[PDB]
Design a protein around this ligand. Sequence first.
Ligand SMILES: *[C@H](O)[C@H](C[C@H](C)C(=O)NC)NC(=O)[C@H](CC1CC1)NC(=O)c1cc2c(OC)cccc2[nH]1
Ligand SMILES: *[C@H](O)[C@H](C[C@H](C)C(=O)NC)NC(=O)[C@H](CC1CC1)NC(=O)c1cc2c(OC)cccc2[nH]1
Lengths: 305, 305
Amino acid sequence: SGFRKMAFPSGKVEGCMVQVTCGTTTLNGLWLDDVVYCPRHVICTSEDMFNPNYEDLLIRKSNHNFLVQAGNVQLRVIGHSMQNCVLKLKVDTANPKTPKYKFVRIQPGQTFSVLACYNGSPSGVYQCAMRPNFTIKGSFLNGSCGSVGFNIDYDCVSFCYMHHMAFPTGVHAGTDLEGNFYGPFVDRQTAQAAGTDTTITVNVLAWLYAAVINGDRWFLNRFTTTLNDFNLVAMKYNYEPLTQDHVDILGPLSAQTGIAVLDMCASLKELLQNGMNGRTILGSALLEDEFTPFDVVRQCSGVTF
Amino acid sequence: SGFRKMAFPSGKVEGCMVQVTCGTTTLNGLWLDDVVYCPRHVICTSEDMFNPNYEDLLIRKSNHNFLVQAGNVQLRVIGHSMQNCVLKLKVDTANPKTPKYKFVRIQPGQTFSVLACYNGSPSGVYQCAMRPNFTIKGSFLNGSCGSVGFNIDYDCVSFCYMHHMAFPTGVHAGTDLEGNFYGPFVDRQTAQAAGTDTTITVNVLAWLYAAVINGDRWFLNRFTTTLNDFNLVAMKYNYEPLTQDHVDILGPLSAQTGIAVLDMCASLKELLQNGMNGRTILGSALLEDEFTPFDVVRQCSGVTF
Ligand SMILES: *[C@H](O)[C@H](C[C@H](C)C(=O)NC)NC(=O)[C@H](CC1CC1)NC(=O)c1cc2c(OC)cccc2[nH]1
Ligand SMILES: *[C@H](O)[C@H](C[C@H](C)C(=O)NC)NC(=O)[C@H](CC1CC1)NC(=O)c1cc2c(OC)cccc2[nH]1
């Protein structure tokens, strides 16, 4: 009953957040076993940001130049190394609150929860989608770098995002936990254009299925379409093409609700061509594309962790 | 940079969630010190729901009739008592993860985070507002009763909501943790009309201030209004009257942005009378009223817990 943008419970990730200070810069790190993972630009100065030689800057630094605090406890650094755009700080204490975890590189269209942190301390949690242009629309202030994004599956935390930078228009960019950026961005203060974003078609369809499950049906029309004729309209409206793999992924939702995927497409096609005409869908006046099919099923069947 | 509906980190509340079983019914409870708090209708049968004598039903029950599980650990019940619509189960073990906490009865217009739980296990977290008609728009399935809503202030969890029931239209109702319902509802399966809801004016104004802080200014007009002429338009549009206490509460936001509260009102008045004309505000096509002034300041100044 009801449908909300829902984040994963954040307690397993809260117990892993730490503060990392090198010189004047303080940001957040992720403490798993005896390793702290943080963005490498913590070793930069204000004037290094425009073109840092990260490898050279790291030469200057010794283990003791890294202050790592977990709450009020200082963690002794005993090894440091770079992996892509992330720093790995080996510490002499293993995090006793380490959950079962994996590092995963997510694909565009997938969603995850963000635990926004400042000074090693969690501020809030919200749900984000990795946009087709490899950005995310989050809420991050100065000092938020090192905040992570994650999914939970029973007991396993799958970390998929670490925050590195913000751009004009509330656009945020980051890396996986192996340090590789999503999309063509660098941890450098230079002109960096995010590509044009598009709407995640399969997530819109998922959210329409969620509307029917929850009672909204005014938009269900009397038509059907082929896959090809739908992707002609999607491209005109800056929607991702719908692939057969997407059709298969909506399968279980189609079976629950009795609406074949291509009938939902016909209903979507008319929403894009005529608009909503003042009406709302699940309390929204815009088509929502930040729910995956799996997000819908979770919320609607009550999957716990 | 960016603005999102943001929940509090839920880890302090996760460590308090337990499963309570009496007979066939299982729901969630909140374990603080040596006490478990849960909705009293856990002692009901399917046919008792229409008109339960809760006091009489509780006579039948003994301490051992209550199964309380925290994860895989069974907690021994050693005392039971009713307080309004909540049950208090004294247990022989004190929750070692009890945070600093208070029980608070919130006022309409205030927001809080909900930790939706099933079988004592957290499923997700999201942010809700207590509507003027004393309902909330959440996402709750069968088995969600006992899930709680809360705010966090530095280290203190202020519990303000416990979930008891759902009504047609994704409308949800519950109690404070002293067991008293918000609004005129009873824990009975009978016809129960929620009053007409209205829009929380002061939260809309807060969210407009958040838009200006974040860069959206197209809606700022060249006009001002008095308090009285604004409340004439608000009432026509099902908006709560704006009180001087609300004007004072928006004070700090007005000072940050340089927009006097009554100028924002003039800008709001024109949005209500002409609509948005296809435009969006902070990525929304509807005026949003589930951010308090304090929610805006938190998100925009980076308050941590
Ligand atoms: C890390 O705390 C910080 C997070 C930012 C502040 C956030 O989410 N809101 C501010 N990251 C940060 O400042 C980046 C620095 C490391 C990558 C080197 N830089 C930026 O985020 C940044 C650079 C630019 C820019 O360069 C030109 C133009 C416009 C905006 C911008 N933002
Ligand atoms: C507790 O798990 C459960 C939560 C519900 C199911 C939820 O959030 N989605 C289902 N609470 C529950 O079922 C309530 C029982 C205790 C108060 C006695 N009852 C209802 O929620 C309820 C009663 C009615 C009704 O009576 C007439 C008409 C329409 C809807 C309704 N819902």
